Amino acid sequence: LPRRIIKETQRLLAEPVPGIKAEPDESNARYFHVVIAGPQDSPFEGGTFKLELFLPEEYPMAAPKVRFMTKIYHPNVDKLGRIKLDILADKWSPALQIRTVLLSIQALLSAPNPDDPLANDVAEQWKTNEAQAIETARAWTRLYAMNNI
Amino acid sequence: PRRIIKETQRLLAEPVPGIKAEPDESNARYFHVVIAGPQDSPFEGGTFKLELFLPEEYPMAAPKVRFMTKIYHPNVDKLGRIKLDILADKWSPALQIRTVLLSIQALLSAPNPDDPLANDVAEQWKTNEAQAIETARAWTRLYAMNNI
Amino acid sequence: MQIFVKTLTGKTITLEVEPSDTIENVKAKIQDKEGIPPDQQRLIFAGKQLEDGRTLSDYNIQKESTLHLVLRLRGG
Amino acid sequence: MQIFVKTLTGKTITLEVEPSDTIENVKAKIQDKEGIPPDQQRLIFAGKQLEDGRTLSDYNIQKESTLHLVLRLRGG
Amino acid sequence: SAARLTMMWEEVTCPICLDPFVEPVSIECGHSFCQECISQVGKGGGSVCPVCRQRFLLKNLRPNRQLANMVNNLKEISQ
Amino acid sequence: SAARLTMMWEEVTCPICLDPFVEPVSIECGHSFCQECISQVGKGGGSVCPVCRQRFLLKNLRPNRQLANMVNNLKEISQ
Ligand SMILES: [Zn+2]
Ligand SMILES: [Zn+2]
Ligand SMILES: [Zn+2]
Ligand SMILES: [Zn+2]
C-alpha cells in the first residue's frame, strides 16, 4: 500500500474534479472504477464513458493500466477499449497522478489524432469523411455512452 | 544602504556578549567598537577599542578595521592594523559586522605567530611564548583597562 | 482578474489575467511560478485542451475559473 | 540538552547535544542543517575559538548556551 | 489559517511520493525531489524531469537544504 | 507563534543582501542567493560561495522557485 496511492485516493474523494469520477474497489485499492464526461465542443459531449484503471506495483514509476469499458468511436481507441496515448507509455511521468491521467484521456477525446492510428478504420474515416465520423461518434455517444450508469 | 540598516538594527536590538558596535552620529559607515578580551587568554579582562568603517562596496568588500587600543599580538602592528584573511582575500559578503568582530575576538584567543605581520612580536611569541604572554597580559592592564 | 490553475501535484496557484489574454500568456505566468516550459504545458478546461492562439474569453473562462495543468500528451 | 548556534545570517538553530559531545560532533549537526563542511566552520563561545578535540563540558557550555558560527579565519 | 499552511505544505511536497521532502535535492532544471524518489526515476545515471521532462544526470544532483529546514519548521508549527 | 513565523522568514532570507529572496538561484554547493546578489559576487565568471567558500561558476546557476513561492506565501500571511 504505497502511501502515494492512499493520498491520491484520498484527494480524489475529497477534492473532486468536474467531469471525472474515480472510486476504488473495496476488494482492490489498486483497481479504480472510473467515469469520464465527454468533453464539450466534441462529438462525445453529453457522454458518460466508463473506464477501468489499475495501478501496477511499480506505480508511480510506471503508468497506470487504463482501458475504456464503454464503446467509443475514436481513432486512438480500439474495439477492446485499449488506449494508445504516449503519457500511458513512453512519455509517462511519475509526477502524473490518476487525476491528470484521466484529464489527459479526456483531452484526447477533445483532440483526436488520426495520422498515428490505433483503430485504422476509424482514422481513415476521420480523414476521408470527417463530418460522417463526427456524426457517428455523436451517435455512439447517445447509443452507448448515455443511460449507461 | 539597507544591509547596513538591518545589520546596525540587530546590533542595537539583539546584542552579542562581549562586543559593542554603535554607529557614529556623523557617519553611519563608521562604527565605534569595543571588544572584550577572550577568557583563558593573555587579553582576559581587557576592553579593546576598535574602529570599523564600511566602504561603499560593502558587503562585496570587507570592512576596514583597526585597533585603537594598544595590543601586543603577532597579527596586529603598532598602528593597530590587523592582518586577518577574512578582512582581505578570504572575505565573504555573508560575513557581517557581528561575525567580523567575533572573528577578531577569536584571533586574540588563537594568535598565529608562525607567519609574521609584526616580526618583532611574532618571533618573540615562538622563541619565548611565556614572556610574550606576560607582556600581552601586562599591556592589557596598562592600556586595555580604565580606557572606557 | 484572478483565475486558478491546479498544478500536477494538485497545488492550486492564483494568476492575475485579463479576458483578452491568450493561453500562451497564461502558460508564461505558470512558467514563471512553476518552471514548466509552455511547450510542455497543456491546460484543460471543461475537458478541452485549450489552444495557444485563442483567448480566455474565447473559452468563456471567467473570474475564479480553475484550469487544470497536464503535460504534453499525444494520441497515437 | 539543547544548545543554540547563531549562523552567519544571524538565524539561530537548535541542536540536541550531550555535555560529552566533541566540537566536531556539533559541526556535523551544523553541517547536516546548514551545509557547511566542518573544515570551514569555526564556533565562538566567550570569545574563544572552540577546538575540535575538546568537549562542551571542557568549556562549561550548559543548557541554552549560544555558540556563534564564523568562517575559517587565519591571522597569519 | 490552515488554508495558507496548506499552500506552504504543498510547496514542500515531493511531486513523486507526495510526502513532505526527505533529503530535498534539485536537478539541472531547478525542480526539487526527494533524493530517493529522483534517484529511482534516474536509475542508470539519468532520465527526464517528472515535472518539465528536461534531461537530468544523477551526478548533477544538488542539495536544497532550505526546503528541508522549512519542512521541519512547518512540522513543528503543527505541534 | 511569531518565533516560528520569523524562523521561516529567515530561511527565505538572502545571506548577502539580507532581504527575502528575489529570483532565488542555487550554486553547485546547494546554497541559494538572489540572482543579482550572487552574480555580482561571481562577476567575471564565478567565485566562492559566501557560506562555505566552495567554488561556483555563474553558468551553473540553478533556479530555486520553491524558495520564491515560500516568500510570496509568507507575504500573504503578514499584512
Ligand atoms: Zn519523494
Ligand atoms: Zn524540471
Ligand atoms: Zn540577495
Ligand atoms: Zn555553499
Side-chain angles (χ1 to χ4, degrees), chain A residues 11 17 39-41 76 84-87 97 99-100 104 106-108 110-111 113 116-118, chain C residues 6-12 44-49 59 68-76:
Chain A
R11 303 164 86 161
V17 182
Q40 71 164 199
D41 303 333
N76 313 102
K84 201 173 50 48
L85 193 56
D86 51 350
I87 64 105
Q97 302 175 4
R99 180 190 75 250
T100 46
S104 298
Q106 189 174 15
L108 174 60
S110 164
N113 185 35
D116 184 12
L118 205 268
Chain C
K6 201 179 172 65
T7 70
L8 284 182
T9 59
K11 187 238 288 197
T12 310
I44 312 303
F45 181 75
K48 301 182 291 187
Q49 197 160 208
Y59 291 119
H68 296 265
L69 184 63
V70 171
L71 290 181
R72 183 183 203 74
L73 68 97
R74 181 189 188 82

Coordinates of all heavy atoms in Angstrom, one line a residue, chain A residues 11 17 39-41 76 84-87 97 99-100 104 106-108 110-111 113 116-118, chain C residues 6-12 44-49 59 68-76:
Chain A
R11 N -7.4 12.4 -2.1 CA -7.7 13.7 -2.6 C -8.7 13.6 -3.8 O -9.3 14.6 -4.1 CB -6.3 14.4 -3.1 CG -5.3 14.5 -2.0 CD -3.9 14.7 -2.5 NE -3.7 16.1 -2.7 CZ -2.5 16.7 -2.8 NH1 -1.4 16.0 -2.7 NH2 -2.4 18.0 -2.8
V17 N -12.8 16.6 -9.2 CA -12.6 17.3 -10.4 C -13.9 17.3 -11.2 O -14.5 16.2 -11.4 CB -11.4 16.8 -11.2 CG1 -11.1 17.6 -12.5 CG2 -10.2 16.6 -10.4
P39 N -15.9 15.6 -23.4 CA -15.5 17.0 -23.4 C -16.6 17.8 -24.2 O -17.1 17.3 -25.2 CB -14.2 17.1 -24.1 CG -13.7 15.6 -24.2 CD -14.9 14.8 -24.2
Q40 N -16.8 19.0 -23.8 CA -17.7 19.9 -24.5 C -17.1 20.3 -25.8 O -15.8 20.2 -26.0 CB -18.1 21.1 -23.6 CG -17.0 22.1 -23.4 CD -17.5 23.4 -22.9 OE1 -16.8 24.4 -23.0 NE2 -18.7 23.4 -22.4
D41 N -17.9 20.7 -26.8 CA -17.5 21.0 -28.2 C -16.7 19.9 -28.8 O -15.8 20.1 -29.6 CB -16.7 22.3 -28.2 CG -17.3 23.5 -27.5 OD1 -18.6 23.6 -27.6 OD2 -16.6 24.4 -27.0
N76 N -8.0 6.7 -31.7 CA -6.9 6.3 -30.8 C -7.4 5.3 -29.7 O -6.6 4.9 -28.8 CB -6.2 7.5 -30.2 CG -5.9 8.6 -31.2 OD1 -6.6 9.6 -31.3 ND2 -4.8 8.4 -31.9
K84 N -4.2 4.1 -27.0 CA -2.8 4.4 -27.4 C -2.6 5.9 -27.1 O -3.1 6.8 -27.8 CB -2.6 4.1 -28.9 CG -1.1 4.0 -29.2 CD -0.8 3.5 -30.7 CE -1.6 4.3 -31.8 NZ -1.4 5.7 -31.6
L85 N -1.9 6.2 -26.0 CA -1.6 7.6 -25.5 C -0.2 7.5 -24.9 O 0.2 6.7 -24.1 CB -2.6 8.0 -24.5 CG -2.6 9.5 -24.1 CD1 -2.8 10.3 -25.3 CD2 -3.7 9.7 -23.1
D86 N 0.7 8.5 -25.4 CA 2.1 8.5 -25.0 C 2.3 8.5 -23.5 O 3.1 7.7 -23.0 CB 2.9 9.6 -25.7 CG 2.3 11.0 -25.5 OD1 1.1 11.1 -25.0 OD2 2.9 12.0 -25.9
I87 N 1.5 9.3 -22.8 CA 1.6 9.5 -21.3 C 1.3 8.2 -20.6 O 1.8 8.0 -19.5 CB 0.7 10.6 -20.8 CG1 -0.8 10.4 -20.9 CG2 1.1 12.0 -21.4 CD1 -1.5 10.0 -19.7
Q97 N -0.7 11.8 -11.9 CA -1.5 11.1 -11.0 C -2.7 10.6 -11.7 O -2.8 10.8 -12.9 CB -1.9 12.1 -9.9 CG -0.7 12.7 -9.1 CD -1.2 13.7 -8.1 OE1 -2.4 13.9 -7.9 NE2 -0.2 14.4 -7.5
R99 N -5.6 11.7 -11.4 CA -6.4 12.8 -11.8 C -5.9 13.3 -13.2 O -6.7 13.4 -14.1 CB -6.2 13.9 -10.7 CG -7.0 15.2 -11.0 CD -6.6 16.3 -10.1 NE -5.3 16.8 -10.5 CZ -4.2 16.7 -9.8 NH1 -4.2 15.9 -8.7 NH2 -3.1 17.4 -10.1
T100 N -4.6 13.5 -13.3 CA -4.1 14.1 -14.5 C -4.1 13.1 -15.7 O -4.3 13.5 -16.9 CB -2.7 14.7 -14.3 OG1 -2.0 13.8 -13.5 CG2 -2.8 16.0 -13.5
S104 N -6.0 13.8 -19.0 CA -5.2 13.6 -20.3 C -6.1 12.8 -21.3 O -6.1 13.2 -22.4 CB -3.9 12.9 -20.0 OG -3.1 13.7 -19.2
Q106 N -9.3 12.6 -21.3 CA -10.4 13.5 -21.6 C -9.9 14.5 -22.7 O -10.6 14.7 -23.6 CB -10.9 14.2 -20.4 CG -12.1 15.0 -20.6 CD -12.6 15.5 -19.2 OE1 -11.9 15.6 -18.2 NE2 -13.9 16.0 -19.2
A107 N -8.7 14.9 -22.6 CA -8.1 15.8 -23.6 C -8.0 15.1 -25.0 O -8.3 15.8 -26.0 CB -6.7 16.3 -23.2
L108 N -7.7 13.8 -25.0 CA -7.5 13.1 -26.2 C -8.8 13.0 -27.0 O -8.8 13.0 -28.2 CB -7.0 11.7 -25.9 CG -6.9 10.7 -27.1 CD1 -6.0 11.3 -28.1 CD2 -6.4 9.3 -26.6
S110 N -11.0 15.3 -27.0 CA -11.2 16.7 -27.5 C -10.3 16.8 -28.7 O -10.7 17.5 -29.6 CB -10.9 17.7 -26.4 OG -10.6 18.9 -26.9
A111 N -9.2 16.2 -28.8 CA -8.2 16.4 -29.8 C -7.7 15.0 -30.4 O -6.7 14.5 -30.0 CB -7.0 17.1 -29.3
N113 N -6.2 12.3 -32.9 CA -5.1 12.3 -33.9 C -5.2 11.1 -34.8 O -4.8 10.0 -34.4 CB -3.7 12.4 -33.3 CG -2.6 12.6 -34.3 OD1 -2.8 13.2 -35.3 ND2 -1.4 11.9 -34.1
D116 N -1.4 9.1 -36.7 CA -0.9 7.9 -36.0 C -2.2 7.2 -35.4 O -2.7 7.7 -34.4 CB 0.1 8.3 -34.9 CG 0.7 7.1 -34.2 OD1 0.5 6.0 -34.6 OD2 1.4 7.3 -33.1
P117 N -2.7 6.1 -36.0 CA -3.9 5.5 -35.6 C -3.7 4.2 -34.7 O -2.7 3.6 -34.8 CB -4.5 5.1 -37.0 CG -3.3 4.7 -37.8 CD -2.1 5.5 -37.3
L118 N -4.7 3.9 -33.9 CA -4.8 2.6 -33.2 C -6.0 1.8 -33.7 O -6.0 0.6 -33.7 CB -4.9 2.8 -31.7 CG -4.4 1.6 -30.8 CD1 -5.5 0.7 -30.4 CD2 -3.3 0.8 -31.5
Chain C
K6 N -4.7 24.4 -11.2 CA -4.3 23.2 -10.5 C -3.1 22.5 -11.1 O -3.2 22.0 -12.2 CB -5.5 22.2 -10.4 CG -5.5 21.2 -9.2 CD -6.7 20.3 -9.2 CE -6.6 19.2 -8.2 NZ -6.5 19.8 -6.8
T7 N -2.0 22.6 -10.5 CA -0.7 22.1 -11.0 C -0.7 20.6 -10.8 O -1.6 20.0 -10.3 CB 0.5 22.8 -10.3 OG1 0.5 22.3 -8.9 CG2 0.4 24.3 -10.3
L8 N 0.4 19.9 -11.3 CA 0.5 18.5 -11.3 C 0.2 17.8 -10.0 O -0.7 17.0 -9.9 CB 1.9 18.1 -11.8 CG 2.2 18.3 -13.3 CD1 3.6 17.8 -13.6 CD2 1.1 17.6 -14.2
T9 N 0.9 18.3 -9.0 CA 0.7 17.7 -7.6 C -0.7 17.9 -7.1 O -1.1 17.1 -6.2 CB 1.8 18.2 -6.6 OG1 1.6 19.6 -6.5 CG2 3.2 17.9 -7.1
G10 N -1.4 18.9 -7.6 CA -2.7 19.3 -7.1 C -2.6 20.7 -6.4 O -3.7 21.2 -6.0
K11 N -1.4 21.3 -6.2 CA -1.2 22.6 -5.7 C -2.0 23.6 -6.6 O -1.8 23.6 -7.8 CB 0.2 22.9 -5.6 CG 0.5 24.2 -4.9 CD 1.3 25.3 -5.7 CE 2.7 24.9 -6.0 NZ 3.5 26.1 -6.4
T12 N -2.8 24.5 -6.0 CA -3.5 25.5 -6.7 C -2.8 26.8 -6.6 O -2.5 27.3 -5.5 CB -4.9 25.6 -6.2 OG1 -5.5 24.3 -6.1 CG2 -5.8 26.4 -7.1
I44 N -6.3 22.2 -19.4 CA -7.6 21.6 -19.6 C -8.6 22.4 -18.9 O -8.5 22.7 -17.7 CB -7.6 20.1 -19.2 CG1 -6.3 19.4 -19.7 CG2 -8.8 19.4 -19.5 CD1 -6.2 19.4 -21.2
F45 N -9.7 22.7 -19.6 CA -10.9 23.4 -19.0 C -12.1 22.8 -19.7 O -12.2 22.8 -20.9 CB -10.8 24.9 -19.3 CG -12.0 25.7 -18.7 CD1 -12.1 25.9 -17.3 CD2 -13.0 26.2 -19.5 CE1 -13.1 26.6 -16.8 CE2 -14.0 26.8 -19.0 CZ -14.1 27.0 -17.6
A46 N -13.0 22.3 -18.9 CA -14.2 21.6 -19.3 C -13.9 20.5 -20.3 O -14.6 20.2 -21.3 CB -15.2 22.6 -20.0
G47 N -12.8 19.8 -20.0 CA -12.4 18.6 -20.8 C -11.6 19.0 -22.1 O -11.1 18.1 -22.7
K48 N -11.6 20.2 -22.4 CA -10.9 20.7 -23.7 C -9.5 21.0 -23.4 O -9.1 21.6 -22.4 CB -11.6 21.9 -24.2 CG -13.1 21.7 -24.6 CD -13.8 23.0 -25.2 CE -13.9 24.1 -24.2 NZ -14.6 25.3 -24.8
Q49 N -8.6 20.6 -24.3 CA -7.3 21.1 -24.4 C -7.2 22.5 -25.0 O -7.4 22.7 -26.2 CB -6.5 20.1 -25.3 CG -5.0 20.2 -25.1 CD -4.3 18.9 -25.6 OE1 -3.2 18.6 -25.1 NE2 -4.8 18.2 -26.5
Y59 N -13.1 31.0 -24.6 CA -13.5 29.8 -23.9 C -14.5 30.1 -22.7 O -14.8 29.2 -22.0 CB -12.2 29.1 -23.3 CG -11.3 28.5 -24.4 CD1 -10.0 28.9 -24.5 CD2 -11.8 27.5 -25.2 CE1 -9.2 28.4 -25.5 CE2 -10.9 26.9 -26.1 CZ -9.6 27.4 -26.3 OH -8.8 26.8 -27.2
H68 N -6.8 23.2 -15.3 CA -6.1 22.0 -14.9 C -4.8 21.9 -15.8 O -4.9 21.9 -17.0 CB -6.9 20.8 -14.9 CG -8.1 20.9 -13.9 ND1 -8.0 20.4 -12.7 CD2 -9.3 21.5 -14.1 CE1 -9.1 20.6 -12.0 NE2 -10.0 21.3 -12.9
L69 N -3.7 21.8 -15.1 CA -2.4 21.6 -15.8 C -2.1 20.1 -16.0 O -2.2 19.3 -15.1 CB -1.3 22.2 -15.0 CG 0.1 22.2 -15.6 CD1 0.1 23.1 -16.9 CD2 1.2 22.7 -14.6
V70 N -1.6 19.8 -17.2 CA -1.2 18.5 -17.6 C 0.1 18.6 -18.5 O 0.4 19.8 -18.8 CB -2.3 17.8 -18.4 CG1 -1.8 16.5 -19.0 CG2 -3.5 17.5 -17.5
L71 N 0.8 17.5 -18.7 CA 2.0 17.6 -19.6 C 1.6 17.2 -21.0 O 0.5 16.6 -21.2 CB 3.1 16.6 -19.0 CG 3.7 17.1 -17.7 CD1 4.8 16.1 -17.3 CD2 4.3 18.5 -17.8
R72 N 2.4 17.6 -21.9 CA 2.3 17.3 -23.3 C 1.9 15.9 -23.5 O 2.6 15.0 -23.0 CB 3.6 17.6 -24.0 CG 3.6 17.5 -25.6 CD 5.0 17.7 -26.2 NE 4.8 18.1 -27.6 CZ 4.4 19.3 -28.0 NH1 4.1 20.2 -27.1 NH2 4.3 19.5 -29.3
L73 N 0.8 15.7 -24.2 CA 0.2 14.3 -24.5 C -0.1 14.3 -26.0 O -0.5 15.2 -26.6 CB -1.1 14.1 -23.6 CG -2.3 15.0 -24.0 CD1 -3.2 14.3 -24.9 CD2 -3.0 15.5 -22.8
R74 N 0.0 13.1 -26.5 CA -0.2 12.8 -28.0 C -1.0 11.5 -28.2 O -0.5 10.4 -27.8 CB 1.1 12.8 -28.7 CG 1.0 12.6 -30.2 CD 2.4 12.4 -30.9 NE 2.3 12.4 -32.3 CZ 2.3 13.4 -33.1 NH1 2.5 14.6 -32.5 NH2 2.1 13.3 -34.4
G75 N -2.1 11.7 -28.8 CA -2.9 10.5 -29.2 C -2.2 9.8 -30.4 O -1.7 10.5 -31.3
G76 N -2.2 8.5 -30.4 CA -1.4 7.9 -31.3 C -2.1 6.7 -32.0 O -3.3 6.8 -32.4

